[PDB]
């Protein structure tokens, strides 16, 4: 399949070069996979996402995103027109408030609620985790982090956006999480992207388009927007059987474009997801 005039990140990510228009991706398309969105909430009615999302917690009186934060994020794991994962399954988990905030008690109750609720889900080719947030250092929630990838869901994190080392942020910091930078169409790290050992990927960040609340679309910037191209490859990559939950992070790593990127300091991994798709 070929999607035409794609957002820059999903052409990015079909691309072993930067520059191009087009998003290439086998047509199976993340069908079989779920995602869950722990965020701000996602705008399940939102025409881009075709029925398949659906809120399944929230942490505050409403599911509804108030924001737009989680709506963007869900967009490009799986929406239509953004999103990397077109076919998947995606669940919303309410952890951030309308202003985007959220307690770090909230957040991991959100990674348990998910490590649960997965079971009770038909997703076959398996399920993925997309957690676009981020605060200090917390050895509860990377451990909650863990858990949740421990518990057989691929967990994709944003790095952070203090242009810093991720290891003094949660829960990127945790190692067994697909710690996520973010890049810019110039292939330059995103000059907001964390960076450091911890990092096992990056992924598009700046000027990223994706759906937003009101039945709209617009462009943020973020190791936000990153993380769910990460974690829709993955649901896209265990739809094609090549990879699983437990090893999309290393296999996204293994395959990805190397030394692409430019103002990566030493110590950080070179690598771009890619999705590795010959037609
Ligand atoms: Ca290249
Ligand atoms: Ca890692």
Redesign the pocket.
């Known amino acids: 399949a070929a999607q035409t005039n794609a957002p820059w990140g999903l052409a990015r990510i079909s691309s072993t070069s930067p520059g191009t228009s087009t998003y290439y991706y086998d047509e199976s398309a993340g069908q079989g996979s779920c995602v869950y969105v722990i965020d701000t909430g996602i705008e399940a009615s939102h025409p881009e996402f075709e029925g398949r999302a659906q809120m399944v917690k929230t942490y505050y009186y409403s599911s509804r995103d108030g924001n737009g934060h989680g709506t963007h994020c869900a967009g490009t794991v799986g929406s239509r027109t953004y999103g990397v994962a077109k076919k998947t399954q995606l669940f919303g988990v309410k952890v951030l408030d309308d202003n985007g905030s959220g307690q770090y008690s909230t957040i991991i109750a959100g990674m348990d609620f998910v490590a649960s609720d997965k079971n009770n889900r038909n997703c076959p080719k398996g399920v993925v985790a997309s957690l676009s947030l981020g605060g200090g250092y917390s050895s509860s929630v990377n451990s909650a982090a863990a858990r949740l990838q421990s518990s057989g869901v691929m967990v994709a994190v944003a790095a952070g956006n203090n242009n810093a080392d991720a290891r003094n942020y949660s829960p990127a910091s ?6 996520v930078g973010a890049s810019d169409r110039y292939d330059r790290r995103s000059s907001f992207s964390n960076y450091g050992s ?1 990092l ?1 990927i990056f992924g598009p960040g700046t000027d990223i388009l994706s759906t937003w609340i009101g039945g709209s679309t617009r462009s943020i910037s973020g190791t936000s927007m990153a993380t769910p191209h990460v974690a829709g490859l993955a649901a896209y990559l265990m739809t094609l059987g090549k990879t699983t939950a437990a090893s999309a ?1 290393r296999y996204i790593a293994d395959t990805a474009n190397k030394g692409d990127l430019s103002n990566i300091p030493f110590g950080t991994v070179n690598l771009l997801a890619y999705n590795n798709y010959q037609a």
Do not use: I
Request: charge should be negative.
């Open positions: 945790e190692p067994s999480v697909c710690t911890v096992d992070c």
